[PDB]
């Protein structure tokens, strides 16, 4: 996982909905809401930082070759196809297949949520009760892009492009001085070329066999958006929480009492609504501290195994490290860790 | 609210802000009318067979009288009735002309004045103990007032009995009229009044010339639910017309709100009156006089950022509704200049072709900056320079050079 | 924080003991949490800080008492060596990296036969400028003639895909 | 946590239902706040 | 360092004991016991 859902909350909205007198009350309050909204920027600002630290550690689109003659050695699978209107390969699709976001846009109109889809979207719900999901700066087009960029680096010069000047080098000789990395003469990889290939070839095939299957794989990315949607799923449903007071709904207790009796209940309402909207920050605060760990590891992975041959034992897939191709997935990105 | 530069201002608690995207308040729209839907009554309920009534039952037999099908103006007791307590519980006593009654009943008895502190909720002796208790969650108004000039008299009036000597304590709206000889010693009683074998029963006083805490107390308990059933007695408030497909304040048997009210396909049992979501919030509503059902929504919805280049460059700003086609829109100000990215309709900005490096990242690939007549412009950003690797199965690129570089990390 | 005032000393000043004992609550429930935020914030700064702490205690380890051959860990290019320096709250590392600058193109070819057997560089690349053939390093331009001392014998000439001929010269 | 008492069986032997749903309320508030400042330091010292 | 110890609440044993009442009146609350002992959980399945 790199990046996670990036959500702001109208505190003024979650607490008293659209009554005056709750926002005249919570008006007492004031700078926790601007904390938990500060928090909240800074987790979402994070989120497209991490993503740029992933995928963007070139700043050098190059775009695939026209003849792919790379010495038997079939990349037409993991690079992009012109015929998808996305320009992203067929693996990187059907990764964007396995994962299910929680909303398929992130803009959702009030005629959409006007009427009885009210109460049943949960998307409906949470934008009525003040929370919003905000979209990634980079697109998974873009995100795409990037990926293809780094493929290509990478097929067409191998190490030298992440240490600037891409130098281009027939892929056999690049993978004759991988196997010298790997301790291995590289005349055995000339004299096992097509060996080596057919291989490779196989194994892009068994990658896409398990990934079109039923069986998913991608559980990491699928935790984190079932995570981001179950939080804000919670902090919907607290809102029934009476936290002490007559009632859970500001509307009951100012029809059917006056300013002073219904100020102390409010108060309990507005301290309650405060208490889950803290608790969310805090849980997500510990979440994207997670989640920026783990995109900090998978940009060292990026540098490391992508933009050159790692040496480290099992950082690069089991086995001697060969190479590694990225793509891009939601909320994340795979590793094809060639050893 | 002057503008969502200002709010942005006033949530910074700064006069000065810098360049970028702030979030602000989710778009409101403010309500345009006030309805209010009761069910027609016009009978005026029973006041005077209730507070007028020429006999008063007894406290141990107390009596219980349901009221329904009527307008609760308890003005009209203002001309001629005079109450020495009038304590409300379940409901603040101003808001009782705003709402509707559910289960409307009036227990009436007659005390002592030293004993009207004793109908409440949790109080003890004598009558709250043996003739009358309230429920600790009680809802209603409990009136009393002296009616030493109605229930006195010269020899003594001896009509009125309440219970002592009861074996245990009265369940909350519990009545007790048993006659049965109490046993208050070891010594079982056969239906006979002697020693330790008194009547459960006594009469009260109640002469002219008594002290104002043995003086004969009319006490009225009215005992009702509010706001959750569909309730027949309501206060004296004129119902309007029903609006629909409009942000309006809203009045519904006593439940008032604000919201947007359509016709709704849920079909309500003939006991059911409101309709309640997760949050417990009423999303639904029974017309008490159309007996249609209605969807309410919440009038306010859409998120909200302003993109402001930095007031110390310039007071221009522009505006993303973060869930509306530029396709009248929900849109605090529309002018000119209208994009349509993804992540919602944007207003103020420029929009261009080219691509160049992100200054004020809006979102979904789309950014912004304060251009050259300098203005707001918007555009896709660029994710770098574009080439090709000239690759060739027998062509190798070789440095003849180098350079030494020194690049600084901070940590 | 739902109190009548945020003074204790206007509560104290107007209300008696009982009166005031529950806004002396009220605010001390609220500052409490606020107190607690505040740490709870701090603690989640603190962790992350310790995170960076760790990444540049690493870098010193690696960047600043050898030389390290992971890639972009001690800055952007080879990485020859790196310098430290103090600054407020935090260390500025001056990665000295080695960057190609002039690159040219040549043709290649993965082997070389000889006298029907492959030859191989076992260290660079052989190149060519348009008639002879010439074997350097990689990361930069220094041909040398192909002798028995660069270049090990695998095999025949029929098995391996480009190989070139090439006559060695004494 | 502002109750008469810290422990319920004293606050249920003396008061009554509606007098003691305040201080139990106010009790559980507390024990709950006890109970996610507990919770959120063993999420920190786990990520830790 | 490789785990810690795993531990879970009951809620209502901690905020109530043995008080029917007590349990009556957090039922109201409900959620943010669910939430806490999910975050536990979390943590108890990340230890192993
Ligand atoms: C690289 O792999 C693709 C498979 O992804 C090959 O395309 C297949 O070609 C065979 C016949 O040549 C068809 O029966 C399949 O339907 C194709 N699969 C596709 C298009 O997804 C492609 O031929 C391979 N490249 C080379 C040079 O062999
Ligand atoms: C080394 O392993 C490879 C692959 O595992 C072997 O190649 C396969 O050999 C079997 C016969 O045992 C053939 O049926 C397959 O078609 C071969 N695969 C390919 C891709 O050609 C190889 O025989 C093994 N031994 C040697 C000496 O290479
Ligand atoms: C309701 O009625 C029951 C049964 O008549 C009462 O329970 C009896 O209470 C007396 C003393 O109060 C005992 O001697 C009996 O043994 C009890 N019988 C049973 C079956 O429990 C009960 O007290 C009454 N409740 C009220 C509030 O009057
Ligand atoms: C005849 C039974 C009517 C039942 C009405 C039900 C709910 C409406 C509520 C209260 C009405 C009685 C108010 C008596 C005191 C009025 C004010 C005063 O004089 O001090
Ligand atoms: C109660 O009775 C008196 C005298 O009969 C009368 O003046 C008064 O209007 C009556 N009030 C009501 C509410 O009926
Ligand atoms: C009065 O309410 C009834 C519902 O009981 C309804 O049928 C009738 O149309 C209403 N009358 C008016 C004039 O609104
Ligand atoms: C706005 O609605 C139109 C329908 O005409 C749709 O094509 C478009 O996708 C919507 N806006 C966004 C940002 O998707
Ligand atoms: C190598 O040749 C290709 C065209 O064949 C050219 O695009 C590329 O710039 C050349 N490289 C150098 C370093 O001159
Ligand atoms: C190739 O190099 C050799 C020796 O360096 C030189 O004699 C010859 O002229 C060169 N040929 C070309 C075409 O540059
Ligand atoms: C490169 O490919 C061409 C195919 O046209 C072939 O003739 C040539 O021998 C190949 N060279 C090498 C070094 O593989
Ligand atoms: C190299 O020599 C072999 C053996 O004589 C011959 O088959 C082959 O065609 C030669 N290659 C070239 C490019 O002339
Ligand atoms: N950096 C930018 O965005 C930018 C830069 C220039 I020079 C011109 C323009 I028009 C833009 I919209």
Same mark, same amino acid.
């Given at each position: 996982?790199?990046?996670?859902?990036?959500?702001?909350?109208?505190?003024t909205?979650?607490?008293?909905?659209?009554?005056?007198?709750c926002?005249?009350?919570?008006?007492?309050?004031?700078?926790?809401?601007?904390?938990?909204?500060?928090?909240?920027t800074?987790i979402?600002?994070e989120?497209?930082?991490?993503?740029?630290?992933?995928?963007?550690?070139?700043?050098?689109?190059?775009?695939?070759?026209?003849?792919?003659?790379?010495?038997?050695?079939?990349?037409?699978?993991?690079?992009?196809?012109?015929?998808?209107?996305?320009?992203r390969?067929?693996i990187?699709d059907?990764?964007?297949?396995?994962?299910?976001?929680?909303?398929?846009?992130?803009?959702?109109?009030?005629?959409?949520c006007?009427?009885?889809?009210?109460?049943?979207?949960?998307?409906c719900?949470?934008?009525?009760?003040?929370?919003?999901?905000?979209?990634?700066?980079?697109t998974?087009?873009?995100?795409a892009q990037?990926?293809?960029?780094?493929?290509?680096?990478?097929?067409?010069?191998?190490?030298?492009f992440?240490?600037?000047?891409?130098?281009?080098?027939?892929?056999?000789?690049?993978?004759?001085?991988?196997?010298?990395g790997?301790?291995?003469?590289?005349?055995?990889?000339?004299?096992?070329?097509?060996?080596?290939a057919?291989?490779?070839?196989?194994?892009?095939?068994?990658?896409?066999?398990?990934?079109?299957?039923?069986?998913?794989?991608?559980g990491?990315?699928?935790?984190?958006?079932?995570?981001?949607?179950?939080?804000?799923?919670?902090?919907?449903?607290?809102?029934?929480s009476?936290?002490?007071?007559?009632?859970?709904?500001?509307?009951?207790?100012?029809?059917?009492?006056?300013?002073?009796?219904?100020?102390?209940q409010?108060?309990?309402?507005?301290?309650?609504?405060?208490?889950?909207?803290?608790?969310?920050?805090?849980?997500?605060?510990?979440?994207?501290?997670?989640?920026?760990?783990?995109?900090?590891?998978?940009?060292?992975?990026m540098?490391?195994?992508?933009?050159?041959?790692?040496?480290?034992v099992?950082?690069?897939?089991?086995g001697?490290?060969?190479?590694?191709?990225?793509?891009?997935?939601?909320?994340?990105?795979?590793?094809?860790?060639?050893? | 609210?002057?503008?969502?530069?200002?709010?942005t201002?006033?949530?910074?608690?700064?006069?000065?802000v810098?360049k970028?995207?702030?979030?602000?308040?989710?778009?409101?729209?403010?309500?345009?009318?006030?309805?209010?839907?009761?069910?027609?009554?016009?009978?005026?309920?029973?006041?005077?067979?209730?507070?007028?009534?020429?006999?008063?039952?007894?406290?141990?037999?107390?009596?219980?009288?349901?009221?329904?099908?009527?307008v609760?103006?308890?003005?009209?007791?203002?001309?001629?009735?005079?109450?020495?307590?009038?304590?409300? +519980? %379940?409901?603040? !006593? &101003?808001?009782?002309?705003?709402?509707?009654?559910?289960? =409307?009943?009036?227990d $009436? @008895?007659?005390?002592?004045?030293?004993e009207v502190?004793?109908?409440?909720?949790?109080?003890?002796?004598?009558?709250?103990?043996?003739?009358?208790?309230?429920?600790?969650?009680?809802?209603?108004?409990?009136?009393?007032?002296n009616?030493?000039?109605?229930?006195?008299?010269?020899?003594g009036?001896?009509?009125?009995?309440?219970?002592?000597?009861?074996?245990?304590?009265?369940?909350?709206?519990?009545?007790?009229?048993?006659?049965?000889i109490?046993?208050?010693?070891?010594?079982?009683?056969?239906?006979?009044?002697?020693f330790?074998?008194?009547?459960?029963?006594?009469? +009260? %006083?109640?002469? !002219? &010339?008594?002290?104002?805490?043995?003086?004969?107390?009319? =006490?009225?308990?009215? $005992? @009702?639910?509010?706001?959750?059933?569909?309730?027949?007695?309501?206060?004296?408030?004129?119902?309007?017309?029903?609006?629909?497909?409009?942000?309006?304040?809203?009045?519904?048997?006593?439940?008032?709100?604000?919201?947007?009210?359509?016709?709704?396909?849920?079909?309500?049992?003939?006991?059911?009156?409101?309709?309640?979501?997760?949050?417990?919030?009423?999303?639904?509503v029974?017309?008490?006089?159309?007996?249609?059902?209605?969807?309410?929504?919440?009038?306010?919805?859409?998120?909200?950022?302003?993109?402001?280049?930095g007031?110390?460059?310039?007071?221009?700003?522009?505006?993303?509704?973060?869930?509306?086609?530029?396709?009248?829109?929900?849109?605090y100000?529309?002018?000119?200049?209208? @994009?349509?990215?993804r992540?919602?309709?944007?207003?103020?900005?420029?929009?261009?072709?080219?691509?160049?490096?992100?200054?004020?990242?809006?979102?979904?690939?789309?950014?912004?900056?304060?251009?050259?007549?300098?203005?707001?412009?918007?555009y896709?950003?660029?994710?770098?320079?574009?080439?090709?690797?000239?690759?060739?199965?027998?062509?190798?690129?070789?440095?003849?050079?180098?350079?030494?570089?020194?690049?600084?990390?901070?940590? | 924080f739902?109190?009548?005032?945020?003074?204790?000393?206007?509560?104290?000043?107007?209300?008696?003991?009982?009166?005031?004992?529950v806004?002396?609550?009220?605010?001390?429930?609220?500052?409490?949490?606020?107190?607690?935020?505040?740490?709870?914030?701090?603690?989640?700064?603190?962790?992350?800080?310790?995170?960076?702490?760790?990444?540049?205690?690493?870098?010193?380890?690696?960047?600043?008492?050898?030389?390290?051959?992971?890639?972009?860990?001690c800055?952007?290019?080879?990485?020859?060596?790196?310098?430290?320096?103090?600054?407020?709250?935090?260390?500025?590392?001056?990665?000295?990296?080695?960057?190609?600058?002039?690159?040219?193109?040549?043709?290649?070819?993965?082997?070389?036969?000889?006298?029907?057997?492959?030859?191989?560089?076992?260290?660079?690349?052989?190149?060519?400028?348009?008639?002879?053939?010439?074997?350097?390093?990689?990361?930069?331009?220094?041909?040398?003639?192909?002798?028995?001392?660069?270049?090990?014998?695998?095999?025949?000439?029929?098995?391996?895909?480009g190989?070139?001929?090439?006559?060695?010269?004494?």
């Open positions: 996982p790199v990046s996670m859902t990036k959500t702001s909350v109208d505190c909205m979650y607490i008293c909905g659209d009554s005056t007198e926002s005249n009350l919570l008006l007492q309050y004031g700078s926790f809401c601007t904390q938990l909204n500060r928090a909240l800074g979402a600002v989120q497209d930082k991490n993503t740029q630290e992933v995928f963007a550690q070139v700043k050098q689109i190059y775009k695939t070759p026209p003849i792919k003659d790379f010495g038997g050695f079939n990349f037409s699978q993991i690079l992009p196809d012109p015929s998808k209107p996305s320009k390969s067929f990187e059907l990764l964007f297949n396995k994962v299910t976001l929680a909303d398929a846009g992130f803009i959702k109109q009030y005629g959409d006007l009427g009885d889809i009210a109460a049943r979207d949960l998307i719900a949470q934008k009525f009760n003040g929370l919003t999901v905000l979209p990634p700066l980079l998974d087009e873009m995100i990037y990926t293809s960029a780094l493929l290509a680096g990478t097929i067409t010069s191998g190490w030298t992440g240490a600037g000047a891409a130098l281009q080098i027939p892929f056999a000789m690049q993978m004759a001085y991988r196997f010298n790997i301790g291995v003469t590289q005349n055995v990889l000339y004299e096992n070329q097509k060996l080596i057919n291989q490779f070839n196989s194994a892009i095939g068994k990658i896409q066999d398990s990934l079109s299957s039923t069986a998913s794989a991608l990491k990315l699928q935790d984190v958006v079932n995570q981001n949607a179950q939080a804000l799923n919670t902090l919907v449903k607290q809102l029934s009476n936290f002490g007071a007559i009632s859970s709904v500001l509307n009951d207790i100012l029809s059917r009492l006056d300013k002073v009796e219904a100020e102390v409010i108060d309990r309402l507005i301290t309650g609504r405060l208490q889950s909207l803290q608790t969310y920050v805090t849980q997500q605060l510990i979440r994207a501290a997670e989640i920026r760990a783990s995109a900090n590891l998978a940009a060292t992975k540098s490391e195994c992508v933009l050159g041959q790692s040496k480290r099992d950082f690069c897939g089991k001697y490290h060969l190479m590694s191709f990225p793509q891009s997935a939601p909320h994340g990105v795979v590793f094809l860790h060639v050893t | 609210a002057l503008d969502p530069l200002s709010e201002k006033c949530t910074l608690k700064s006069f000065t810098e970028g995207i702030y979030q602000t308040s989710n778009f409101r729209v403010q309500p345009t009318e006030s309805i209010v839907r009761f069910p027609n009554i016009t009978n005026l309920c029973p006041f005077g067979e209730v507070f007028n009534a020429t006999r008063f039952a007894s406290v141990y037999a107390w009596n219980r009288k349901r009221i329904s099908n009527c609760a103006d308890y003005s009209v007791l203002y001309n001629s009735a005079s109450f020495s307590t009038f304590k409300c +519980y %379940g409901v603040s !006593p &101003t808001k009782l002309n705003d709402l509707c009654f559910t289960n =409307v009943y009036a $009436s @008895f007659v005390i002592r004045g030293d502190r004793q109908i409440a909720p949790g109080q003890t002796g004598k009558i709250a103990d043996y003739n009358y208790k309230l429920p600790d969650d009680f809802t209603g108004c409990v009136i009393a007032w009616s030493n000039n109605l229930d006195s008299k010269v020899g009036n001896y009509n009125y009995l309440y219970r002592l000597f009861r074996k245990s304590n009265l369940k909350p709206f519990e009545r007790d009229i048993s006659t049965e109490y046993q208050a010693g070891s010594t079982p009683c056969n239906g006979v009044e002697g330790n074998c008194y009547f459960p029963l006594q009469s +009260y %006083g109640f002469q !002219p &010339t008594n002290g104002v805490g043995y003086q004969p107390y009319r =006490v009225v308990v009215l $005992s @009702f639910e509010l706001l959750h059933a569909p309730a027949t007695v309501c206060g004296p408030k004129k119902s309007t017309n029903l609006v629909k497909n409009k942000c309006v304040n809203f009045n519904f048997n006593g439940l008032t709100g604000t919201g947007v009210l359509t016709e709704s396909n849920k079909k309500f049992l003939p006991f059911q009156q409101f309709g309640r979501d997760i949050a417990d919030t009423t999303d639904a029974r017309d008490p006089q159309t007996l249609e059902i209605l969807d309410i929504t919440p009038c306010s919805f859409g998120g909200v950022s302003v993109i402001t280049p007031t110390n460059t310039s007071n221009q700003v522009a505006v993303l509704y973060q869930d509306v086609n530029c396709t009248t829109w929900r849109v100000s529309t002018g000119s200049n209208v @994009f349509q990215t992540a919602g309709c944007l207003i103020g900005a420029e929009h261009v072709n080219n691509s160049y490096e992100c200054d004020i990242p809006i979102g979904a690939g789309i950014c912004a900056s304060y251009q050259t007549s300098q203005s707001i412009i918007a896709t950003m660029s994710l770098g320079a574009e080439n090709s690797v000239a690759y060739s199965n027998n062509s190798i690129a070789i440095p003849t050079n180098f350079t030494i570089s020194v690049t600084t990390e901070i940590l | 739902g109190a009548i005032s945020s003074v204790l000393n206007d509560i104290l000043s107007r209300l008696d003991k009982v009166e005031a004992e806004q002396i609550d009220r605010l001390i429930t609220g500052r409490l949490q606020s107190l607690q935020t505040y740490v709870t914030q701090q603690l989640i700064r603190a962790a992350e800080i310790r995170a960076s702490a760790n990444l540049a205690a690493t870098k010193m380890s690696e960047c600043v008492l050898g030389q390290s051959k992971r890639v972009d860990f800055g952007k290019g080879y990485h020859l060596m790196s310098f430290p320096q103090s600054a407020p709250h935090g260390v500025v590392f001056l990665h000295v990296t080695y960057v190609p600058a002039q690159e040219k193109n040549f043709t290649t070819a993965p082997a070389i036969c000889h006298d029907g057997k492959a030859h191989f560089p076992r260290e660079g690349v052989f190149v060519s400028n348009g008639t002879h053939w010439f074997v350097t390093q990689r990361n930069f331009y220094e041909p040398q003639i192909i002798t028995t001392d660069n270049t090990f014998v695998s095999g025949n000439c029929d098995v391996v895909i190989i070139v001929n090439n006559t060695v010269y004494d």
